């Protein structure tokens, strides 16, 4: 009973100087393989982030393997949320506030593929 989900309903908030992305999981199960897909046209100023026990660093376009997600027992409506700051987690200047509008208004979107066990 393997079900693959591609989630692209990432909503964005902020806490202080840092961006907070969030996507909802519509079915429970045990993740066997997860990967985040970053699509963008503008530089992300070496923004580091955390998602699903995984450290990545989005500079431009990239598809990161969410390594630490293998085995996460998710539930219905469990919100996967992570934090992201530019300059290797230093949040220097209004960069992250710019990178925010690159997420809310398109030009930078996330794509969450999950290989679960339902």
């Amino acid at each position, epitope marked *: 009973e393997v079900r693959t989900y591609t989630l692209t309903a990432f909503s964005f908030s902020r806490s202080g100087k840092q961006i907070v992305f969030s996507v909802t999981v519509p079915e429970a199960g045990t993740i066997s393989s997860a990967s985040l897909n970053v699509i*963008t*046209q*503008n*530089y992300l*100023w*070496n923004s580091r982030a955390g998602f699903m026990n995984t450290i990545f660093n989005m*500079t*431009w*376009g*990239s598809t990161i393997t969410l390594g630490g997600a293998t085995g996460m027992m998710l539930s219905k409506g469990q919100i996967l949320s992570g934090t992201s700051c530019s*300059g290797n987690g*230093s949040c*220097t*200047g*209004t*960069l992250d506030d710019r990178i925010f509008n690159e997420l809310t208004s398109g030009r930078t979107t996330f794509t969450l593929t999950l290989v679960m066990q339902v």
Partner: nanobody
Amino acid sequence: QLQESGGGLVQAGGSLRLSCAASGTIFDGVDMGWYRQAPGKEREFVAGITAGSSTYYADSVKGRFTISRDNAKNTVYLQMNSLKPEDTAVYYCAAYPLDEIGSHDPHSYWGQGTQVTVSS
């Protein structure tokens, strides 16, 4: 002061070699990328290289183009092969200061933009 060199109208299947002129040491170990922009189209990504000499290409230019940089020359190259008529656009070169002991918000400085055209 950023600036581009190379480019100009070439026929389909031709090749061009753009070079980016980074004026000063402010650009050493700095992430720099290439962008194109046609009339009626917004600025689209093309190719980029990080300080660690990585490679970040677009999809419409994957495998056809090739980016690189000579870290000592302060020059980023974009080798364009198998050129198609959609590649006709002003090719701008952008660099991004990654906390080079700056003061204000590390802005995004660009070049002026060399012209590239592909005829049938």
